[model samples]
Target chain A: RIAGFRFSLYPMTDDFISVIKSALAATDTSKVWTKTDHISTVLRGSIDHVFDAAKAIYLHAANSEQHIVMNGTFSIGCPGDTQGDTYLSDKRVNEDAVRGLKAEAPCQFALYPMNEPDYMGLIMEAVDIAKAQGTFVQGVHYASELDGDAHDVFSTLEAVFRMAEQQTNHITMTVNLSANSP
Target chain B: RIAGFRFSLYPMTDDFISVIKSALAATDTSKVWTKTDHISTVLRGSIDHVFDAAKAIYLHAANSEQHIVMNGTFSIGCPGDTQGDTYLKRVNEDAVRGLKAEAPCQFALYPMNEPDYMGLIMEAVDIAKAQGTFVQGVHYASELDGDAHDVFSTLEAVFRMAEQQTNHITMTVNLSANSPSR
Candidate 1:
């Protein structure tokens, strides 16, 4: 199974270009197919690799003082009707490199688990875990928002995502993260 | 019918707060019930009014010299939802205001619980291609580059295509205007 996401990172700084370029430089997209456009960049490969590269780049570019926003939609079980058939190797790329990193952002997220009839129960349980971790902010329209360090925000999402994954074969998650909001 | 999005806007400027504040002030959000947190804002209202407030805010915050990114996920037909939905009582027709904003958008559609997911996705791609906004398909995401009005129109068609086939559907749209990363 292949997973992919199209993502864009906006760093609120005058030299935002430099910030984005540097972040992309630090990420190892060797395991995924990479395509950059004017709007966003697409990363397709192993589920772990895709998330790794996407998260690594965002963490690298974000600072405690700048408000950075990363918006990404991740999906699996599509028709695979794209040009990224070539980059499908799976391996770890600096597993703990981003562990200690902190961007301290608020993340608004929605997790969709396909093939699961009890989807709301799954979603509600995940929200409970986020609350346990103290990242739960509140409920908004159609999604649950989390506020905390970027590390935990992403951790909560991944944990919630995996929880759903265990119950269903297809899933999608929409993540919008913002850091250093004034 | 209830629909809306959770969106976050990033302006790459030193005075990004002013840009965001002014944009929100300029746009008439009275038609939508809105909520904001550190991470993002949730706007719930009528379909057209939702798009109207979103696009209007983006246009207001956008410029030819600065890079800005607006990331939003539009979801309809979730199992149980809709908070502060009363703000949608009135109707408003002033959107895009005939003002032009160039946004190259990357979006993906999720048709929940539909075994014919691929066909639905492909048809949406065909719709986008015919609308002149189709840029390319990368991995699981589709790109539509054009004016905000046309891009939104294309998205509307894509979303509509899936709405006929399934009761639950969502779309992730990441738009960037004046981005310097290209």
Candidate 2:
């Protein structure tokens, strides 16, 4: 199971850029990163802080009606294995995030689950953000090897994502995995 | 409830006289009543048939979608009364006769329930037929009020009709009553 977050940046109008900048500023991060090159930003923070930053970004930057590609990445496991199953624990955390967000905005959105747990979590968090706005979400980029049991992990994710989609017509989903790794 | 059929007069491109003659020829004693003021036809043999026939008519007759208006005066009772129900059923049977002729046809295109059953059936048939070749057999009107336990019966009927009719038509169904009635 590979875990990582990936998203695309579109050329936003000046109006959206200003809003996004303000929302990002609200997170009160020590540093701000911006460039013409679209790339994923990996940040270190408590889970709650990371969510706050992401929420600010979504509220200020994401288009409610138009399609947008947004992504993030986090570190799930280091070189040495952790004691408990971070994977299962992360799944529950993701569900809570999704439900909470779904109560907010109510729109359709997607989450691209990368091979890494951090990446997948980032996508799940994004879905939570979208769900808050009444948006549908899809978890993207799930790699079989990283999760130990590929089919089981993928199936669980599918069920969770579809439950979110059923709430709104706006939500959609698509999952991509590493063929060579499997 | 009212009942009525949805049928098309032949194409204007075809010999108008022949079209009329054909329509007249098809309206036999078994199929239709020569003396009845209202011309009737069926959209399909089943729910799927209704959808398919509606599509065929929509494709051939550019704006041929038509609806019937029924009155409770056809019987002693109002729209919900037994007499009104009987009138609607007869009206549907007549409409089916007409629909069957111009198009390959289906069965009772609409269900007889309450209010304007004939009119509503005609509207449903017209909507289906109006969908034309691109989406034939995509609409299925079924017994929605009679049985509480038979879930997705309409959808099953649609599939059955679609399977029997083969490739000429196709249909999509709304899984919930909250969805668009058409």
Candidate 3:
């Protein structure tokens, strides 16, 4: 019922701290409750607002010359106390320009299984599922990449990651997504 | 010469805070320097030590009773300045190790200012493939899926290898375990 994200920006430049500070200042995080810590920042709000804040913050830090990395872990339906639940908004906070903007999400992800001995078989099974689902963009670096609407992208990630979870004791997946790249 | 990782552990339970505190107490940090934050922790040291600490922490958090997620970014030749302590291993690492762990992730490597970026990327790709963690390839990234150990092994090798070709390198990865199937 609630969504939150913990994210950090990595910009490869001597003035990296400056880039992060400027990005933080440039971002409009009015929709989420933001708390910056030593290594990362936590944003609590609606799902759309959380995603908007993360993407906008990332875009702000990203530069054509300096390689940038924005890593965030997004979660929904916290099991415990909801400290920032008050910040949750019923209305969408995505920019009007991107409000229903049909830009694609180019994403790649990896799924990790805890204590599963037949790891390869499980990973290959997901690959096969991706082929049938058609969200399978290709196989590149460490796992599979999906290209489609955010719907299909996340759908594919969950499907593949789920395929392993059903059989394994524990599961973990990581995805890196890029959009509006220059 | 120096390497670091910024990471966070998310446990799915009502007493999530307890899980994190216990995991932190259980894992060893003596090999690396650590600073904890509201959302994540930053570790600085040799690349291997950094990887060891992250992997150990995640496994310890793998209480098996609860779902867990660990998101992290590993970097080398940061260019950003930091000359940072040793922390000893507690009880949690061993108990969790007996259970085992691995992760699926999409990874991207940014080598600052290299004319032949493709070659550099491919070289790293080969390392992942050889490390037994390569799943497939996406457009500008690779999908390396494997046990958390194998995945980190590939990322560590790739990041350290980049030091030879570029003055700065950043590799981003997110790993999770026992998360909601979606």
What do the candidate models score in CA lDDT, each in turn?
Answer: 0.75, 0.27, 0.61
TM-score of 2: 0.22
Predicted model with the maximum TM-score: 1
Model 3 Cα lDDT, one tens digit per residue, A7-119? 65644344555766777777777888887643456677766676666666655655323444455555443223355443745544545533343445566555544334465
Score residue A72 of candidate 2 by CA lDDT: 26
Error of 2 at B55 (Å): 40
DockQ of 1: 0.59
Estimate, for each residue in A67-163, the C-alpha lDDT of model 2 and write its tens digit.
Answer: 2223222222222322332222121222322222211221112232222224334445545544443323332111111121222333333444444
Top DockQ prediction, candidate number:
1
DockQ of each: 0.59, 0.01, 0.03
What DockQ score does model 3 reach against the true complex?
Answer: 0.03
Worst 10 residues of 3 chain B by lDDT: B84-93
Residue by residue across B1-182, what tens digits does model 2's lDDT show? Answer: 12122232322122333433343343222322122211223222233233333333332232222211110000011122222212111223334333321122222221211223334444444434443311232111121221111222332343344333221121222111111112
Q: What is the TM-score of chain B alone in each candidate?
A: 0.89, 0.25, 0.82
Sorted into a CAPRI-style docking class, model 2 comes out as incorrect
Local accuracy of candidate 3 as per-residue lDDT tens digits, B21-127: 98888876677878774435777777667877777787777655565656656666634344543332332345445656657666666554454545777798899
DockQ head-to-head 2 vs 3, winner = 3
**Candidate 1 lDDT, tens digit per residue, B43-144?**
886677777687777777775346777877777777676454636322323544556778888788877767777688889899998999998876657788
